[PDB]
Amino acid sequence: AVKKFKPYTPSRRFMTVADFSEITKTEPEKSLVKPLKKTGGRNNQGRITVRFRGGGHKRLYRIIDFKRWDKVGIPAKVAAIEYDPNRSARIALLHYVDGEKRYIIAPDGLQVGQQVVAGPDAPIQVGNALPLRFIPVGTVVHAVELEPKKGAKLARAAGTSAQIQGREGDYVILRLPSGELRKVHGECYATVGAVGNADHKNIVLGKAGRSRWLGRRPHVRGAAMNPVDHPHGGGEGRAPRGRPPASPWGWQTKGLKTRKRRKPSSRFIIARRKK
Amino acid sequence: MRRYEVNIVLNPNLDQSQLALEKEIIQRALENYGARVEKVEELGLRRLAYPIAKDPQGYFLWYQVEMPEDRVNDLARELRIRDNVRRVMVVKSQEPFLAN
Amino acid sequence: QVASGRAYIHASYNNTIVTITDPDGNPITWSSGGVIGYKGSRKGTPYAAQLAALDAAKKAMAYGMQSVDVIVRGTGAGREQAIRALQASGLQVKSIVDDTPVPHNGCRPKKKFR
Amino acid sequence: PITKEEKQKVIQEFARFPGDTGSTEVQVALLTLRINRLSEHLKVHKKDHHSHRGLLMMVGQRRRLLRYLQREDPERYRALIEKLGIRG
Amino acid sequence: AKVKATLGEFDLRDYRNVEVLKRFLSETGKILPRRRTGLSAKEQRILAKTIKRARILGLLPFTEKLVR
RNA sequence: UGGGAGAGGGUGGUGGAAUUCCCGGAGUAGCGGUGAAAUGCGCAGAUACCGGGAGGAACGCCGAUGGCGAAGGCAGCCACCUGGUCCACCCGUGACGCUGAGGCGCGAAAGCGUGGGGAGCAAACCGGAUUAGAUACCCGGGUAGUCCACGCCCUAAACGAUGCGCGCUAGGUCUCUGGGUCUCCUGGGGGCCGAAGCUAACGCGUUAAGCGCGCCGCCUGGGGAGUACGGCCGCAAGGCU
Ligand SMILES: [Mg+2]
Ligand SMILES: [Mg+2]
Ligand SMILES: [Mg+2]
Ligand SMILES: [Mg+2]
Ligand SMILES: [Mg+2]
Ligand SMILES: [Mg+2]
Ligand SMILES: [Mg+2]
Ligand SMILES: [Mg+2]
Ligand SMILES: [Mg+2]
Ligand SMILES: [Mg+2]
Ligand SMILES: [Mg+2]
Ligand SMILES: [Mg+2]
Ligand SMILES: [Mg+2]
Ligand SMILES: [Mg+2]
Ligand SMILES: [Mg+2]
Ligand SMILES: [Mg+2]
Ligand SMILES: [Mg+2]
Ligand SMILES: [Mg+2]
Ligand SMILES: [Mg+2]
Ligand SMILES: [Mg+2]
Ligand SMILES: [Mg+2]
Ligand SMILES: [Mg+2]
Ligand SMILES: [Mg+2]
Ligand SMILES: [Mg+2]
Ligand SMILES: [Mg+2]
Ligand SMILES: [Mg+2]
Ligand SMILES: [Mg+2]
Ligand SMILES: [Mg+2]
Ligand SMILES: [Mg+2]
Ligand SMILES: [Mg+2]
Ligand SMILES: [Mg+2]
Ligand SMILES: [Mg+2]
Ligand SMILES: [Mg+2]
Ligand SMILES: [Mg+2]
Ligand SMILES: [Mg+2]
Ligand SMILES: [Mg+2]
Ligand SMILES: [Mg+2]
Ligand SMILES: [Mg+2]
Ligand SMILES: [Mg+2]
Ligand SMILES: [Mg+2]
Ligand SMILES: [Mg+2]
Ligand SMILES: [Mg+2]
Ligand SMILES: [Mg+2]
Ligand SMILES: [Mg+2]
Ligand SMILES: [Mg+2]
Ligand SMILES: [Mg+2]
Ligand SMILES: [Mg+2]
Ligand SMILES: [Mg+2]
Ligand SMILES: [Mg+2]
Ligand SMILES: [Mg+2]
Ligand SMILES: [Mg+2]
Ligand SMILES: [Mg+2]
Ligand SMILES: [Mg+2]
Ligand SMILES: [Mg+2]
Ligand SMILES: [Mg+2]
Ligand SMILES: [Mg+2]
Ligand SMILES: [Mg+2]
Ligand SMILES: [Mg+2]
Ligand SMILES: [Mg+2]
Ligand SMILES: [Mg+2]
Ligand SMILES: [Mg+2]
Ligand SMILES: [Mg+2]
Ligand SMILES: [Mg+2]
Ligand SMILES: [Mg+2]
Ligand SMILES: [Mg+2]
Ligand SMILES: [Mg+2]
Ligand SMILES: [Mg+2]
Ligand SMILES: [Mg+2]
Ligand SMILES: [Mg+2]
Ligand SMILES: [Mg+2]
Ligand SMILES: [Mg+2]
Ligand SMILES: [Mg+2]
Ligand SMILES: [Mg+2]
Ligand SMILES: [Mg+2]
Ligand SMILES: [Mg+2]
Ligand SMILES: [Mg+2]
Structure with missing residues (x-):
């Protein structure tokens, strides 16, 4: 669910927060955290390369297992569910039977203390990892490697999940959260179920600073700039766009495809995103 | 508990080892989900009125049992999982109804 | 060239199609109302199917066809008479079957079927 | 559902006397079992209103009865409900 | 040519009695x-459900082509 | 206590036919549509055929003058959870009952909010036709909406235009489901014609609109008007009075 407040300040009348209820432990696993180096958009030159960032609350990065084939056939117990301000999903605190601990993100439906395992012969049940040539066609999955051994790349945000459509040769076919149909590889692990916190998107920040706590600054309109700054800028009084709506760098921003043409991944992409 | 009639249809092409192995899964999965067998009636391959799994034949089983009423559903959900399991119909066993 | 084959009669209120296929089902030749030179409701006539069915058969055998199993779909007033000339054409008409499609209460139809 | 057995145990544990059936005290306890199992039932299937009707008529009965018992044997009115925790 | 006479004792619930059950489906697979069929009310109803279940198991057809 | 039938309601799985689009093979000059035509689609390869895949919705025959439900309403199969109801045996309590202003809950379709979903169909809309005109009836497209979840909304030819319970008053034929002794008898529902009786007539008639008792709602010419005012409810459209 999601929690609302009363209009007891003008910004609460709308604001909404998660309920966390799936939360179990309120303290990260020291040995799994490490410093997250904030950037402010700027790069190895001090120049902003990602407009309008900086000033968000300080965070402490939870190292995550996007491999999980790192330990084949070593079951574990979901010790606790934690919260990672470094992503929209929830992390699962896994105590393997080796003794080693490490973090994953919470598939929807996990329960503290239940057991999970990775491996080809692993059971298809919300919380386990397998390749793709071994998962039942039609099962909703996530945390999908895009290629063998390169780590989970797909379906990693809240409610995100990819469903298996069919099989072809050494590859398999998935439906991405973007409606796209792509050939993935069978030897690329996944994790049954869908990601958690699916109530995320229904969130109303309610006021301006709450976007600052998130490190995302104010975003100005090209209409409010000047011609030296933005293509849309200037013009006495207000004004329409006077041209194909463009980015501050010149190029258009209303239906101009930029996915590189001669890109090999095409051969493995089928249905471009929908809607 | 309750007594039903586990009605299962499996891939007709598998080999004997490919065959009963699924059954073992069935037998175990049966057992795991508090299933107690009674009768049984394995009728082999057979002609179908229409292709299942785009395969005209289909090798049937049939188990009368008695399991906990509150555990039947998770079963079939366990049995339909097999890429070789293709039909699975549970039916509350009921007194026959005769004619003439 | 093929001797035995098939024949499908799509019989509809507004017209009638006659397409002849290879045993596998790959069409080999086809024909319907307008092909013989009719435009409009006149197409929705049996005699059309005759020429239609006929003109399709005539062209068919020209490729070697001599036998074909029959398949009819639809409820057209030009249906049966089409089945006629086909028999009275020059082909052995090895069989007749009505595979007319019918849902089981699926999609809704247009306003004019209610 | 409720088991014939489960039904008996109650019956016996409220029968006025050995071969007691169809008496106020028991007549309330049965409903009380059916009720408490509808409510505990409805706490999930929030949409099945249909069933939710008799649930009212059930309590309607029990409420009709109890007051009869209320009218006749007071001490007996309390003790009972107290044994079932029924007054809200 | 009613059918119930054509047979004697037989389970309306033997949802696997194809050779029998398939006897009540016109050569077009319809019920x-x-x-x-000569069956009565309660009877008749008890059938189909029997047929249907099989028609789902893969025994009986949902429909059949027609031959003239 | 023992049983029986059933689209009663809710959750989760699930089965096949058809429409639409995508991909592949084959194939040619028109398909589609109408009262007739046209817009439209088609040599950039459509229509009709075969094969594979994806997605949504509604469940053909059974099926019906049928069934269940207080109502709206409910229809593929399966299981689970649950309601009401009927029959028998005549076992227990021993008038514990009927009605019900208020209150509360349910409430088809459309409509509203949030988040999904979106094949077919389809208000507004565009187009093509008929017309003196055609902001319509027919045709080609097509957006919301129709589908799911949670919230509202609470109206209707929500009809049997017939409030609910009980008792009394010929029967005949049909049908559903029970019980018997199985010819037939008895309970409970669903239709039909009709005893007396009622009724302004048409009509009803053991499912009364008949003779009665109890309780609630309601009418008091037509229109103005289910409008105005106030009050309540509601996000709004609008509802109640
Ligand atoms: Mg608050
Ligand atoms: Mg609040
Ligand atoms: Mg304020
Ligand atoms: Mg405010
Ligand atoms: Mg708020
Ligand atoms: Mg909260
Ligand atoms: Mg939480
Ligand atoms: Mg929660
Ligand atoms: Mg701390
Ligand atoms: Mg450290
Ligand atoms: Mg770091
Ligand atoms: Mg960094
Ligand atoms: Mg540096
Ligand atoms: Mg430097
Ligand atoms: Mg420098
Ligand atoms: Mg800088
Ligand atoms: Mg940027
Ligand atoms: Mg920045
Ligand atoms: Mg932050
Ligand atoms: Mg959140
Ligand atoms: Mg937001
Ligand atoms: Mg922003
Ligand atoms: Mg701005
Ligand atoms: Mg300016
Ligand atoms: Mg400058
Ligand atoms: Mg410029
Ligand atoms: Mg400008
Ligand atoms: Mg100006
Ligand atoms: Mg201008
Ligand atoms: Mg301009
Ligand atoms: Mg790649
Ligand atoms: Mg399967
Ligand atoms: Mg049986
Ligand atoms: Mg035509
Ligand atoms: Mg009751
Ligand atoms: Mg009371
Ligand atoms: Mg469309
Ligand atoms: Mg093609
Ligand atoms: Mg096709
Ligand atoms: Mg019908
Ligand atoms: Mg009816
Ligand atoms: Mg007695
Ligand atoms: Mg006595
Ligand atoms: Mg009442
Ligand atoms: Mg409503
Ligand atoms: Mg609706
Ligand atoms: Mg809206
Ligand atoms: Mg709005
Ligand atoms: Mg929407
Ligand atoms: Mg659309
Ligand atoms: Mg239209
Ligand atoms: Mg004009
Ligand atoms: Mg005009
Ligand atoms: Mg118009
Ligand atoms: Mg249309
Ligand atoms: Mg809207
Ligand atoms: Mg609107
Ligand atoms: Mg709507
Ligand atoms: Mg809506
Ligand atoms: Mg009302
Ligand atoms: Mg009516
Ligand atoms: Mg009525
Ligand atoms: Mg009225
Ligand atoms: Mg009266
Ligand atoms: Mg009988
Ligand atoms: Mg009667
Ligand atoms: Mg009459
Ligand atoms: Mg008279
Ligand atoms: Mg009178
Ligand atoms: Mg009645
Ligand atoms: Mg009343
Ligand atoms: Mg007046
Ligand atoms: Mg007046
Ligand atoms: Mg009104
Ligand atoms: Mg007002
Ligand atoms: Mg009003």
Whole structure:
């Protein structure tokens, strides 16, 4: 669910927060955290390369297992569910039977203390990892490697999940959260179920600073700039766009495809995103 | 508990080892989900009125049992999982109804 | 060239199609109302199917066809008479079957079927 | 559902006397079992209103009865409900 | 030519009695009514459900082509 | 206590036919549509055929003058959870009952909010036709909406234009489901014609609109008007009075 407040300040009348209820432990696993180096958009030159960032609350990065084939056939117990301000999903605190601990993100439906395992012969049940040539066609999955051994790349945000459509040769076919149909590889692990916190998107920040706590600054309109700054800028009084709506760098921003043409991944992409 | 009639249809092409192995899964999965067998009636391959799994034949089983009423559903959900399991119909066993 | 084959009669209120296929089902030749030179409701006539069915058969055998199993779909007033000339054409008409499609209460139809 | 057995145990544990059936005290306890199992039932299937009707008529009965018992044997009115925790 | 006479004892619930059950489905695979099956009300109803279940198991057809 | 039938309601799985689009093979000059035509689609390869895949919705025959439900309403199969109801045996309590202003809950379709979903169909809309005109009836497209979840909304030819319970008053034929002794008898529902009786007539008639008792709602010419005012409810459209 999601929690609302009363209009007891003008910004609460709308604001909404998660309920966390799936939360179990309120303290990260020291040995799994490490410093997250904030950037402010700027790069190895001090120049902003990602407009309008900086000033968000300080965070402490939870190292995550996007491999999980790192330990084949070593079951574990979901010790606790934690919260990672470094992503929209929830992390699962896994105590393997080796003794080693490490973090994953919470598939929807996990329960503290239940057991999970990775491996080809692993059971298809919300919380386990397998390749793709071994998962039942039609099962909703996530945390999908895009290629063998390169780590989970797909379906990693809240409610995100990819469903298996069919099989072809050494590859398999998935439906991405973007409606796209792509050939993935069978030897690329996944994790049954869908990601958690699916109530995320229904969130109303309610006021301006709450976007600052998130490190995302104010975003100005090209209409409010000047011609030296933005293509849309200037013009006495207000004004329409006077041209194909463009980015501050010149190029258009209303239906101009930029996915590189001669890109090999095409051969493995089928249905471009929908809607 | 309750007594039903586990009605299962499996891939007709598998080999004997490919065959009963699924059954073992069935037998175990049966057992795991508090299933107690009674009768049984394995009728082999057979002609179908229409292709299942785009395969005209289909090798049937049939188990009368008695399991906990509150555990039947998770079963079939366990049995339909097999890429070789293709039909699975549970039916509350009921007194026959005769004619003439 | 093929001797035995098939024949499908799509019989509809507004017209009638006659397409002849290879045993596998790959069409080999086809024909319907307008092909013989009719435009409009006149197409929705049996005699059309005759020429239609006929003109399709005539062209068919020209490729070697001599036998074909029959398949009819639809409820057209030009249906049966089409089945006629086909028999009275020059082909052995090895069989007749009505595979007319019918849902089981699926999609809704247009306003004019209610 | 409720088991014939489960039904008996109650019956016996409220029968006025050995071969007691169809008496106020028991007549309330049965409903009380059916009720408490509808409510505990409805706490999930929030949409099945249909069933939710008799649930009212059930309590309607029990409420009709109890007051009869209320009218006749007071001490007996309390003790009972107290044994079932029924007054809200 | 009603059918119930054509047979004797037989389980309306033997949802696997194809050779029997398939006897009540016109050569077009459809279920046959009561002016044609001789079955009664409660009877008739107890059938189909029997047939249907099989028609789901893969035994009986949902429909069949027609031959003239 | 023992049983029986059933689209009663809710959750989760699930089965096949058809429409639409995508991909592949084959194939040619028109398909589609109408009262007739046209817009439209088609040599950039459509229509009709075969094969594979994806997605949504509604469940053909059974099926019906049928069934269940207080109502709206409910229809593929399966299981689970649950309601009401009927029959028998005549076992227990021993008038514990009927009605019900208020209150509360349910409430088809459309409509509203949030988040999904979106094949077919389809208000507004565009187009093509008929017309003196055609902001319509027919045709080609097509957006919301129709589908799911949670919230509202609470109206209707929500009809049997017939409030609910009980008792009394010929029967005949049909049908559903029970019980018997199985010819037939008895309970409970669903239709039909009709005893007396009622009724302004048409009509009803053991499912009364008949003779009665109890309780609630309601009418008091037509229109103005289910409008105005106030009050309540509601996000709004609008509802109640
Ligand atoms: Mg608050
Ligand atoms: Mg609040
Ligand atoms: Mg304020
Ligand atoms: Mg405010
Ligand atoms: Mg708020
Ligand atoms: Mg909260
Ligand atoms: Mg939480
Ligand atoms: Mg929660
Ligand atoms: Mg701390
Ligand atoms: Mg450290
Ligand atoms: Mg770091
Ligand atoms: Mg960094
Ligand atoms: Mg540096
Ligand atoms: Mg430097
Ligand atoms: Mg420098
Ligand atoms: Mg800088
Ligand atoms: Mg940027
Ligand atoms: Mg920045
Ligand atoms: Mg932050
Ligand atoms: Mg959140
Ligand atoms: Mg937001
Ligand atoms: Mg922003
Ligand atoms: Mg701005
Ligand atoms: Mg300016
Ligand atoms: Mg400058
Ligand atoms: Mg410029
Ligand atoms: Mg400008
Ligand atoms: Mg100006
Ligand atoms: Mg201008
Ligand atoms: Mg301009
Ligand atoms: Mg790649
Ligand atoms: Mg399967
Ligand atoms: Mg049986
Ligand atoms: Mg035509
Ligand atoms: Mg009751
Ligand atoms: Mg009371
Ligand atoms: Mg469309
Ligand atoms: Mg093609
Ligand atoms: Mg096709
Ligand atoms: Mg019908
Ligand atoms: Mg009816
Ligand atoms: Mg007695
Ligand atoms: Mg006494
Ligand atoms: Mg009442
Ligand atoms: Mg409503
Ligand atoms: Mg609706
Ligand atoms: Mg809206
Ligand atoms: Mg709005
Ligand atoms: Mg929407
Ligand atoms: Mg659309
Ligand atoms: Mg239209
Ligand atoms: Mg004009
Ligand atoms: Mg005009
Ligand atoms: Mg118009
Ligand atoms: Mg249309
Ligand atoms: Mg809207
Ligand atoms: Mg609107
Ligand atoms: Mg709507
Ligand atoms: Mg809506
Ligand atoms: Mg009302
Ligand atoms: Mg009516
Ligand atoms: Mg009525
Ligand atoms: Mg009225
Ligand atoms: Mg009266
Ligand atoms: Mg009988
Ligand atoms: Mg009667
Ligand atoms: Mg009459
Ligand atoms: Mg008279
Ligand atoms: Mg009078
Ligand atoms: Mg009645
Ligand atoms: Mg009343
Ligand atoms: Mg007046
Ligand atoms: Mg007046
Ligand atoms: Mg009104
Ligand atoms: Mg007002
Ligand atoms: Mg009003």
